[PDB]
Structure 1
């Protein structure tokens, strides 16, 4: 427990140091909105084919009957610009809605519980997630579980003790060269093959790969 707590604290410090060294997802949308806003302000500096950019100049030097075509041209140019801006904002809003739905599902599953789906709440086996406040967004501290050190083992899918095939309930039969043990698929916990963790299903003449092993049978010593 102390080792896992120290590893979690070291990971928290590591991501705190790494995040202090910019953000990609949050800074992109702000930059796009700023660019769209700047383009909207700079649109009125053009003429759109007319003889003037500002309506005041053309309305002053020319009468509104003469300025009718120029005012209409500016009106339709600004309408086209506003329609393009609205379409771009609608596409961006659809993208943000999809991202917010994804983040809401992530908060529902990985934060409010342990999601059984892999590669959805961080790489590796997910344990928990810690949401943090962000400007115009949210981040998740996906506390995952990955293996570090492994060893090569010899495996047997079944054990024939007294003419009957034995299969592990949760573990797997592994060997280090001389003896055989059962352990889980995510950690090395060698245990003596017994009746409690193995069940008998048929005979041992139906499997292609098998080894000649024995069962401790813990009921037997306590009978004496």
Structure 2
């Protein structure tokens, strides 16, 4: 009986130790799931590759046996085109930098457009600001800037 008691006690202690380690792993995954519920679903996340692959827009929770399932809605750019760019535009001895965007060119004319989508616009003084002269910035180009 003492032999059997020692063997069954060892078996039960092994089971309890394995259950404790698996419970620690499950608690780590549950903490990650709670963080994902707080940040993906209840808001919008700027963290890269958190809340899915791409630029995160929305997330939805779904129930599951012994877990949770997230449906991450993301924004993926699709069709790109080659363009010629420049860091600044030299106009009347002044360096013009874009406010929020990027200078592009279709070969002949220069446009300023946003970075994640191709929506070209005429370079005016409303979307560009002035800082310095044209002999400091490397790669500056000559163009006119429309004044409304």
CA RMSD of aligned residues (A): 0.7
- What SS class does the counterpart of residue 157 from structure 1 fall into? coil
Q: TM-score, normalised by structure 1?
A: 0.65
TM-score by length of 2: 0.97
Residue 208 of structure 1 deviates from its aligned partner by 1.0
Unmatched tracts of structure 1, length 5 or more: 1-70, 218-224
Deviates most, 72-81 or 99-108 = 72-81
How many Å separate the matches in 1 of 2:129 and 2:3? 85
Post-superposition offset of 1:177:
0.4
Q: Report Cα offsets for 1:20-74 as digits up to 9, x if no partner.
A: xxxxxxxxxxxxxxxxxxxxxxxxxxxxxxxxxxxxxxxxxxxxxxxxxxx1111
User: Which of the pair is proportionally richer in helix?
Assistant: 1
Aligned residue for 2:100, secondary structure, equals coil
Question: Shift in Å at residue 83 of structure 1?
Answer: 1.1
Task: Give the Cα separation in 1 of the matches to 2:128 and 2:67.
Answer: 50
By how many angstroms is 1:146 displaced?
A: 0.6
Structure 1: 4+ residue segments shifted above 3 A: none
Measure, in 1, the Cα distance between the counterparts of 2:99 and 2:9.
70
Higher relative contact order (CA 8 A, sep 6+): 2
**Number of matched residues?**
147
Cα distance in 1 for residues equivalent to 2:114 and 2:3: 75
Write 1 or 2 for the structure with the bigger share of strand: 2
**Deviation at 1:80?**
1.1
